[PDB]
Subunit: 261 residues, 5 copies
């Protein structure tokens, strides 16, 4: 969302600044519950595990188009990123189960995953499943023809994050054996009672240069941003639980680089 | 366009202030607390009272008139949350932890935030529930939609008024604030312990990557804060936010600039 | 004070070593280091805590080797505090789970001390400057304590009337006062508050750790009238008796402070 | 091995990439990456865990481009300089719909949580291990390699229990640790976090590198042109809807950068 | 000391390696590394813990190459400890949840070791200097222990009468004594106490970590009488038996210390 691209060229020197956000793809079970999943089911036998599409958070991604240009290529040098709306979880009056008789609502808590990537091509993913026998729904892209080895490392499960709201977060991780032309960062914190801990500051910049001083190079003059920001579980007054996600901001600086094809 | 730092005898000034917390102040005696929290309101019928909603605090601090032109440049800040030991009173009002025990400490979700800028803090609105009906005397996202639960770029505001912008509705906007520095941490959960450090030896440098601090437009500095420490649980089981004031000491220097006009 | 140069070498350096005992309330002669059992659920309009229930800040004034014996030589010296090594004394005493504490379950050991804690020290050349802040401005504080006077609802946030020196040991309740960040130009203070029923005490000891007390201009606290001021509060958590009653437990703090002679105008 | 100069030539650098699958017990063909359900409350005199209940260390020998023989010219060995490593599949624990006990009526499944151990090593020879037992009287199964001649002293430090991690899916994690008295030619890193309610906390990034050079600037030297990687990544316990519990493990990726080093022998 | 290796190379350097066993109480011959089960709720006026219930500090004197035939010199050569590498041994043993421990719930695995823990080591040129502090000054400590003498209520805070040397292994209860920050001029010590009934043990191992033992003047512990002292306490937490009874569990600690010869003022 909100993609803005600015190229400034003075002679030899060309800079592009990209600003955008990615909305989260938590499942959106109805139009009013944008940012949430469908309520979670539980205790499905591994042999009869058929999760509904709207229950499954997916990775977010966007292809950002750059000024269409040894080759000259756009090189991503820095990123500033932030999770947007962390204070929204201070609403304990709407929908959440009371913590006790006469108390306020229960904060969002529980397992969470915060992840982003910036690359010159789609993020390369490796599939790993909790249960290889899970039957995934139409509209998801999940590991093809999985086996019990898919519960550990099965090198058959290679994919590109090339479609928004399609690759379930539970099925896929960034592939550390690939991604030579992207930088990715994620933290998984698991557990029923895990507190969300989120920091915001406009003073943080991540440098995307590798050990040789080279950033992601934008093949075919396109930049890819990717995210997943599952903040935890929202517990309804009935006890049902729904994932809650938040959008992620990106500001990326790129420069024009002459490079070996 | 920034030129050189002025290096006279009177080229430095120090500003000190504190910001009181704006938790809701539900009666004349409960300054620093919110109204007791409601719970389990349907998203379609969520009408929080004003005194239940903590707000961001801010102050415009007028600076010596200087005047192509000189502007005050904020270089460092020392800041501290004031009165953290008041939470060691476990005899007053709080529910016993168990039969024969002391009162329950303040605990639960918290948010600690401050900013220093040369202009008002720029905010982005994000809601837990876009259908919340916010009370008279609050400034909340205007004409929100389900997209306001994720990122809706319509929701831009300046923190220009005290006791107005609820913390649950607004975050510092990472797409703006070019002339401010902000820092916040949200920690969510029923059982989160407050962890607060005080020392007069800690300094935050406000200079950006180019060595430039916030520049005080119109010879005014803006400080902003929110310090929701957690929930106070009354002996009845009702819960109220507790906030604390924030101290600021800002060092500024005179900076020559080309009038940007 | 206009600060000039550090004085040279040999006897230009002194070390002060001391400890501060904790002031937790000491409800009987056998329970030194503990508070009285905590009360709970007092209405804000009828909150009258007993003295022995209220931990207080510890403080001492340490007299330093006399400088400026030669009053009219026109070269004025003050001791400058440069470094401190400090730690909490007796942290392993909390491994006694056989005495007094409630069993964790049938046949189990005693419950460890845990819960809200506050660890704080300061080193200054004058008394520590405090700001009063109350949970409940209507609290009626007992004889023997020094607490914010004539408080109002504003005293629950920031009321600038409540300024005091930490000028008496075992008198200023920790729950009423904090170091004032708007003052203390001639002291350094450090504190961490961790609140909650189930917080674990986490305490580190090492004789290899040093805190430098010099400010941004390289100047440490300057000891007015050849006096060094140490202050502490080390509330370790709550001790839960077999009945379920709870008492604060505190421990002493050690200080080793290195000072040098500083010329001043 | 006496090290001489780093070689700087054209083919002086190589990269090895691999992953190690976890060895959690694999109690049936469908439950790769899990252990058998845990037994509990076995007397120390009658503790005989089944093989499928015991997570084991993973290890592999990685062959390197052949160098070299003192009679066949100059001596060269690969030196491991850096490693990039991470745990693969951490997001799979976001499946709370399959198998796991509901957290409460109408709730989602219980996340994997509880005791965990994350460990890796890179060496020029097999990892050297020291045996330590919870209970020296534990009878370990066919197919495992456990401390030989265990005694009560094996519950603390029995220097008899020395082994090389030279076999995958054989050395139970609960019986063995890396030996800090050996491993002169390897680097190892591990963290154990124990408890019923411990949250898994796992970071991934392709920007993180661990330098394997020692204080003299020397990395693991790959004897016989082989590198050894070792891992254990027990992520926590999976709680079935019945209340039974199973360990869950995940694979570990390694990318190791090596350079050619001249050596005397 | 379970095992000791002392190597003095051609280059006037000594490397000392040892493993120091924990002293948790050892209530029977099969429960090495554990304490006796804990008692609870003893009145402060009737608190008489049994010896086997009380973990004690571990210590050993390590003999070094005897340097000075001519002890009657104004300058002496002494061993100077420069670095230490240390590790807690056997942390993965706590992954045994099948033996002895109470089930977490019906059909579950055993309860992990958890609760209060203390991890401590020291390297010195002489015995570790200790300060006594008691939870309860009226505790009656058993035969075979060395505990603060003639304690008073001040012994529950700081009573400077309680000075001791850690001069006996398996004798000084951890609950009674701490390293004395007012002494130990010729030793370095490091400890972390984490208290609480549900605390998770968190233990890291790596052979890449080294602690430098030099003071601010670049001088390490100087080994008086050609002896080095290592000291430890590694209480990992409580083991909960299926009955509900609890026992401390401890682990051994490895030391690798590098020393050099220093000419010093007699
Ligand atoms: Ca599909
Ligand atoms: Ca690769
Ligand atoms: Ca591209
Ligand atoms: Ca601060
Ligand atoms: Ca302004
Ligand atoms: Ca009396
Ligand atoms: Ca008495
Ligand atoms: Ca030959
Ligand atoms: Ca060795
Ligand atoms: Ca050895
Ligand atoms: Ca080899
Ligand atoms: Ca001393
Ligand atoms: Ca000695
Ligand atoms: Na008192
Ligand atoms: Na196996």
């Amino acid at each position: 969302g909100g993609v803005e691209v600015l190229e400034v060229k003075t002679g030899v020197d060309a800079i592009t600044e990209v600003e955008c956000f990615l909305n989260p793809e938590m499942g959106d079970p109805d139009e009013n519950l944008r940012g949430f999943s469908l309520k979670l089911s539980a205790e499905n036998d591994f042999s009869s595990d058929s999760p509904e599409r709207k229950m499954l958070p997916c990775y977010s991604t966007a292809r950002i188009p750059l000024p269409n240009l040894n080759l000259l290529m756009w090189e991503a040098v820095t990123v500033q990123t932030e999770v947007i709306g962390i204070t929204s979880m201070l609403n304990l009056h709407a929908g959440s189960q009371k913590v006790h008789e006469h108390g306020g609502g229960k904060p969002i808590q529980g397992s969470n995953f915060h992840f982003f990537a910036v690359g010159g091509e789609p993020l390369e993913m490796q599939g790993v499943l909790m249960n290889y026998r899970s039957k995934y729904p139409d509209g998801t892209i999940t590991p093809k023809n999985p086996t019990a080895q898919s519960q550990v490392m099965n090198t058959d499960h290679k994919a590109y994050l090339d479609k928004n709201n399609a690759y379930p977060v539970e099925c896929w991780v960034p592939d550390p054996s690939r991604n030579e032309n992207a930088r990715y960062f994620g933290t998984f914190t698991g557990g029923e009672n895990v507190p969300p801990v989120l920091h915001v500051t406009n003073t943080a910049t991540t440098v995307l240069l590798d050990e040789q001083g080279v950033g992601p190079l934008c093949k075919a003059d396109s930049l890819y941003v990717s995210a997943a920001d599952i903040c935890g579980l929202f517990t309804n007054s009935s006890g049902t639980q729904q994932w809650r996600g938040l959008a992620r901001y990106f500001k990326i600086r790129l420069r024009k680089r002459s490079v070996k094809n």
